[PDB]
Amino acid sequence: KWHFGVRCRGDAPEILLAVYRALQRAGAQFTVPKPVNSDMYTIKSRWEIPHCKREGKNTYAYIELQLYEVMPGCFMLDVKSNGYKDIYSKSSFPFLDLCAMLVCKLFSA
Amino acid sequence: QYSTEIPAFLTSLQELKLPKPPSLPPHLEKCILNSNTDQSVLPNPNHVLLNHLAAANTQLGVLALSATTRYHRKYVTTAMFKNFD
Amino acid sequence: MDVQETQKGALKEIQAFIRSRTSYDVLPTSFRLIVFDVTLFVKTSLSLLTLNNIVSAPLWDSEANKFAGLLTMADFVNVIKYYYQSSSFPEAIAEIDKFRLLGLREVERKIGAIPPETIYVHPMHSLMDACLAMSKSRARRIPLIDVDGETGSEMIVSVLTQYRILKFISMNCKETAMLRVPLNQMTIGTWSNLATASMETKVYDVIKMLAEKNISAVPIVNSEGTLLNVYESVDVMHLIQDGDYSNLDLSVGEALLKRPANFDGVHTCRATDRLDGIFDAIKHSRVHRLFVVDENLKLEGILSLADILNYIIYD
Numbered sequence: 001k002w003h004f005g006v007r008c009r010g011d012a013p014e015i016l017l018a019v020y021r022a023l024q025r026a027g028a029q030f031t032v033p034k035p036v037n038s039d040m041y042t043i044k045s046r047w048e049i050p051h052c053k054r055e056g057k058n059t060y061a062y063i064e065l066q067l068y069e070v071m072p073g074c075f076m077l078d079v080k081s082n083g084y085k086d087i088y089s090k091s092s093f094p095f096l097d098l099c100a101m102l103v104c105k106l107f108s109a
Numbered sequence: 110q111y112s113t114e115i116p117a118f119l120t121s122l123q124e125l126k127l128p129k130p131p132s133l134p135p136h137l138e139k140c141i142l143n144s145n146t147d148q149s150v151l152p153n154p155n156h157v158l159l160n161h162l163a164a165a166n167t168q169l170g171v172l173a174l175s176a177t178t179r180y181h182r183k184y185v186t187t188a189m190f191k192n193f194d
Numbered sequence: 195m196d197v198q199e200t201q202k203g204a205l206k207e208i209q210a211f212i213r214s215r216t217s218y219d220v221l222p223t224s225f226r227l228i229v230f231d232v233t234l235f236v237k238t239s240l241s242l243l244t245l246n247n248i249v250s251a252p253l254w255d256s257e258a259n260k261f262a263g264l265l266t267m268a269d270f271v272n273v274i275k276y277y278y279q280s281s282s283f284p285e286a287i288a289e290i291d292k293f294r295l296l297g298l299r300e301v302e303r304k305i306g307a308i309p310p311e312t313i314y315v316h317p318m319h320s321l322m323d324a325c326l327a328m329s330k331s332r333a334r335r336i337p338l339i340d341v342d343g344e345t346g347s348e349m350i351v352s353v354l355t356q357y358r359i360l361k362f363i364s365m366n367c368k369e370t371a372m373l374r375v376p377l378n379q380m381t382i383g384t385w386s387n388l389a390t391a392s393m394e395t396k397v398y399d400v401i402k403m404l405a406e407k408n409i410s411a412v413p414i415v416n417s418e419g420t421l422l423n424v425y426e427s428v429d430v431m432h433l434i435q436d437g438d439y440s441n442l443d444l445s446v447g448e449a450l451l452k453r454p455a456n457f458d459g460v461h462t463c464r465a466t467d468r469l470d471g472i473f474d475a476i477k478h479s480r481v482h483r484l485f486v487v488d489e490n491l492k493l494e495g496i497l498s499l500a501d502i503l504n505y506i507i508y509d
């Protein structure tokens with residue numbers, strides 16, 4: 001039953017677009033493929049942590065997303081955490097809480 | 110370096126014969142939560158998997174989410190049961 | 195020098211030991227932690243406890259990223275008993291299936307069952323701090339919560355349960371072996387006025403024995419007075435996980451019939467016996483309480499895990 005990231009099947013950049021549109025909806029900002037005049041499936045999203053925003057803090061959470069082929073037609077959207085960060089100067093939350101957000105978004109397109 | 114607008118090239122369809130994503134490496138094949146190896150004790154977590162999302166179906170209408178994460182020198186894999194709305 | 199003084203000194207060591215260790219030193223080197231979102235419906239949570247084999251889950255308020263209390267089996271024990279003593283309507287009880295955890299805890303706040311103070315210790319503070327709380331209250335488990343600096347988020351590290359610290363000190367202390375003073379020479383456990391039940395007893399009448407007495411379990415005795423079994427409060431999960439709240443109208447016998455084989459057991463000892471032995475118990479078997487009996491398994495008393503943690507924690 002337990003397996004990394006979120007399963008997805010279909011067309012290479014059709015899920016990548018799914019994954020882009022889902023990111024917009026949550027608010028998270030994201031990096032964009034730089035065409036060379038494959039890494040386009042490596043997205044670095046910067047999410048605003050809502051339990052900080054509404055308090056006033058500008059602390060963000062940083063989530064890289066990776067897509068892999070698992071077998072022909074079948075893919076995994078891996079989702080890693082690169083920690084959290086304030087503007088001025090570990091744990092699985094808000095990270096798990098935001099994967100919750102993203103996954104809800106992916107599923108309701 | 111972060112953008113809020115959805116990237117254009119995707120919209121308009123099968124555009125250039127686009128570059129393929131990488132295949133799944135053996136490291137993300139096996140998730141330690143598949144283990145009855147005290148039934149909270151887990152196998153030592155991988156060095157590299159730390160901070161990677163894991164998911165499972167519940168048959169119950171909820172999302173099950175987990176990550177393993179370090180805490181000082183011991184490891185905490187934490188499983189989340191949570192609604193959709 | 196002697197038995198009553200070798201024990202007095204070994205006692206002196208095992209306390210000193212636990213001031214010197216953190217709650218953290220107790221947790222496995224690598225372990226899981228199930229968490230329930232406080233917005234979960236009750237039915238769901240109960241299915242999730244059964245399916246994961248667990249009797250408890252710490253609660254996450256994902257909204258403010260805080261810990262919204264602890265879901266033990268005591269919650270269900272407290273609502274039904276209230277519903278039974280307050281409602282003129284026997285079926286009113288089935289209504290706690292609409293409720294989300296949040297809303298069950300709201301009923302529990304109102305009744306005075308759930309303290310306003312949400313109880314917690316920091317993991318890197320002494321193991322003592324976990325013992326004194328659980329003891330000052332009669333809780334039988336305690337959350338270890340730290341707070342993430344860069345976010346103000348509450349990192350929920352683990353849950354620490356009487357048995358696991360008692361299993362811990364059993365294993366990591368030689369002095370458990372030097373505790374050879376028999377129970378009949380100690381001021382420990384309950385010996386007069388035990389709450390009991392027979393198979394013919396109704397389950398709703400056990401479970402409130404549980405609430406009122408504030409006890410984890412009730413033993414089941416026969417007419418000759420001999421111990422047969424125990425209806426635990428965790429046994430309540432196995433009665434309502436199907437959302438048939440009228441299984442609370444069964445006899446204990448009828449109820450125990452539905453109990454599955456995944457059962458830690460009913461543990462005994464002579465009043466002659468001593469602590470050194472019950473530590474050997476809790477070191478290997480999953481013990482939760484010892485029942486003092488005699489020649490013919492007649493019940494003479496109850497030595498409980500808190501009974502023993504508190505005997506050793508207090509100077």
Ligand SMILES: NC(=O)c1ncn([C@@H]2O[C@H](COP(=O)(O)O)[C@@H](O)[C@H]2O)c1N
Nearest residue numbers: 383384387388389409410496498500501
């Ligand atoms: N059947 C009983 O009366 C009974 N069961 C437990 N107890 C006592 O009540 C206290 C709480 O027990 P526990 O924490 O195991 O629920 C302990 O001091 C224990 O000796 C009782 N008196």
